[PDB]
């Protein structure tokens, strides 16, 4: 008996059931929730209207019987006073989207892509940090040969920018990437801009009447127009860059089966194709510059620093003839500067400054925020030189995400491998190289006609699309890309003669056009979607012109 009881007690204690509840005495056999006074007072007060005490509701529910007829009658009644509209798209077509009106949407990315000029040198493995390369490029004298003038082509506060550039050169000469706190930097750094708090306990009506202290009137963004410079950047980011290896990548592991061989082969093809473009160098630039800036913000806050805008690459591989084993290269596009990144909290902001080099004059519509200066001349023969200068800010999140800008490769590889494997399975044969060299994909229009090229060269469009999604990401683009799916699904239904329908498309168009403001990507993609539905109307219904 004692052994059995010991085993049972151990088991129960292990199950938390060794209490009066499961093992009561004769008396303690009535367990019940200790219904107090206040709880009951409330329960009898939260009851629906027709009842006034929980007892009535309980008696009505415990005895409730089904009367289908009254239910059907109420159903029909509610079905008559509603008049839910049903709209087959074929009869009620989709109008075009109404973009806003006003000035043009200007450049927003922190760094220049097409107008960027860079100085290159050879990389030595010993000197590989930024604070070192920024000096190496400084000794040869070109970085010091620059000497802008007090007369800017466009912009504001040119004196501050000039003094800041002079201080940057001086600090570089001192071998210390540091800057002192003067009036100029304090202004172009907003060092004293934060508002001074005033407690209410110390407040009075006379104080208010002295200086108006009304509630802040939020000035939401203002509209813009369609940018005409986006296609230029998109077409420039599709061509080679005279070098490769712009984006660092790891090594390939061994292989034992055909699967890994196939994967490695395809990955090598795609990586070699993509690493030569221009968008790639911008990705590498962002990666490295953001890494350096994050390190600095972590180590040297409360201190103005100097960080370069650079990248590392490798000259292309010619034939065995000539100098074999091509060398590496360190490229420098401009200079960057931070300002007291006291990142007390995520989503914060630390102002920075961008000094970049270019050889192309600006446009008022596009390069609106920049403040350009005429610097001098540089070789290639000699050509004039410009200095684009502006101000902006960043945060922890944008840093972390920009540093992680290698996801576009994953997405593109997914799409391509999917297409190729689907085409290969329908025929039960290795159709990958053929699908990459032959299968044509629409890209754009020229002279009112369509244009096409093999997937092997169309990958670049998807890559740039993903990169821009990573760059211009905001709430506006989020909502847009979330609300455009309906249109694509309706289009697919149109392609397959599926008689689609909807309840209120006008509201959908309204929701879409609501989130199109001063964000170039949304405007561009919306215009392109309109052009899509137009081109398809020649082959499909459900769209108005």
């Amino acid at each position: 008996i004692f052994s059995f009881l010991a085993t049972a007690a151990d088991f129960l204690r292990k199950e938390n059931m060794f209490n009066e509840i499961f093992l009561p005495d004769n008396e303690e056999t009535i367990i019940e929730m200790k219904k107090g006074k206040t709880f009951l007072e409330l329960r009898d007060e939260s009851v629906p209207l027709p009842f006034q005490t929980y007892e009535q509701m309980k008696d009505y529910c415990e005895k409730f019987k089904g009367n289908p007829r009254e239910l059907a009658s109420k159903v029909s009644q509610m079905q008559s006073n509603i008049k839910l509209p049903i709209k087959h798209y074929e009869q009620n077509k989709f109008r075009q989207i109404r973009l806003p009106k006003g000035p043009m949407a200007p450049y927003t990315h922190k760094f220049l892509m097409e107008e960027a000029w860079m100085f290159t040198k050879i990389s030595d493995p010993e000197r590989s940090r930024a604070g070192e390369i920024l000096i190496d490029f400084f000794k040869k004298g070109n970085l010091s040969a620059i000497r802008p003038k007090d007369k800017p082509l466009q912009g504001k506060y040119p004196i501050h920018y000039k003094n800041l550039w002079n201080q940057i050169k001086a600090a570089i000469a001192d071998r210390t990437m540091v800057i002192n706190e003067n009036d100029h930097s304090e202004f172009l750094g907003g060092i004293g801009r934060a508002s001074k708090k005033i407690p209410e306990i110390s407040l009075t009506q006379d104080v208010i009447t002295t200086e108006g202290l009304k509630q802040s009137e939020n000035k939401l963004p203002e509209p813009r127009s369609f940018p005409r410079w986006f296609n230029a950047e998109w077409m420039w980011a599709i061509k080679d860059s005279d070098l490769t290896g712009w984006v660092p990548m790891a090594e390939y592991p061994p292989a034992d089966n055909e699967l890994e061989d196939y994967a490695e082969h395809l990955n090598k093809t795609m990586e070699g194709v993509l690493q030569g473009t221009n968008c790639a160098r911008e990705m590498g630039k962002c990666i490295l510059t953001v890494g350096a800036l994050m390190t600095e913000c972590r180590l040297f806050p409360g201190k103005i620093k100097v960080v370069p805008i650079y990248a590392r690459s490798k000259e292309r591989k010619s034939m065995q003839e000539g100098l074999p084993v091509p060398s590496e290269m360190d490229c420098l596009f401009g200079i960057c500067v931070k300002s007291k990144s006291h990142l007390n909290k995520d989503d914060g902001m630390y102002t920075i400054i961008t000094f970049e080099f270019s050889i192309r004059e600006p446009n008022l519509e596009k390069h609106q925020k920049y403040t350009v200066f005429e610097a001098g001349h540089t070789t290639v023969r000699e050509v004039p030189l410009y200095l684009y200068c502006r101000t902006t800010a960043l945060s922890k999140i944008k840093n972390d995400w920009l540093s992680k800008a290698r996801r576009c490769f994953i997405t593109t590889m997914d799409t391509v491998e999917t297409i190729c494997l689907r085409e290969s399975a329908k025929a039960e044969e290795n159709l990958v190289e053929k699908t990459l060299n032959e299968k044509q994909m629409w890209i754009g229009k020229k002279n009112g006609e369509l244009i096409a090229q093999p997937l092997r060269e169309a990958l670049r469009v998807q890559l740039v699309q993903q990169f821009y999604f990573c760059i211009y990401n905001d709430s506006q683009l989020e909502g847009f890309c979330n609300e455009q799916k309906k249109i694509l699904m309706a289009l697919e239904g149109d392609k397959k003669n599926k008689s689609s329908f909807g309840f209120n498309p006008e509201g959908l168009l309204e929701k879409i056009e609501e989130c199109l403001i001063n964000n170039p990507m949304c405007l561009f993609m919306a215009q392109r979607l309109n052009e899509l539905v137009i081109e398809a109307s020649k082959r499909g219904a459900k769209f108005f012109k």
Binding site: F2, S3, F4, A6
Partner: protein, 97 residues
Amino acid sequence: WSKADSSKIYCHGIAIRVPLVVGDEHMDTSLALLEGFSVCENDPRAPMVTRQDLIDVGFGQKVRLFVGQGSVRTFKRTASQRAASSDVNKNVKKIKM
């Protein structure tokens, strides 16, 4: 038999389960003694000992002991041959009449 499984005896292929009352040179823990012990009414007079000195007791003696955590009991080196399978079923069948 084997030193690995010292609790079995193989005769003509058939297997036989030897009880665990005493431990020879091979058996090297109290695990071989547990089928010789059992629980009994608590007695504060008996001594309190460890799980290793548990082998130096005499058959039929009592001793207090610590079990697991936060638990003390009293054991006796006397076994109980039967298990519940028979003492319940029989008494049950004696009720359907």
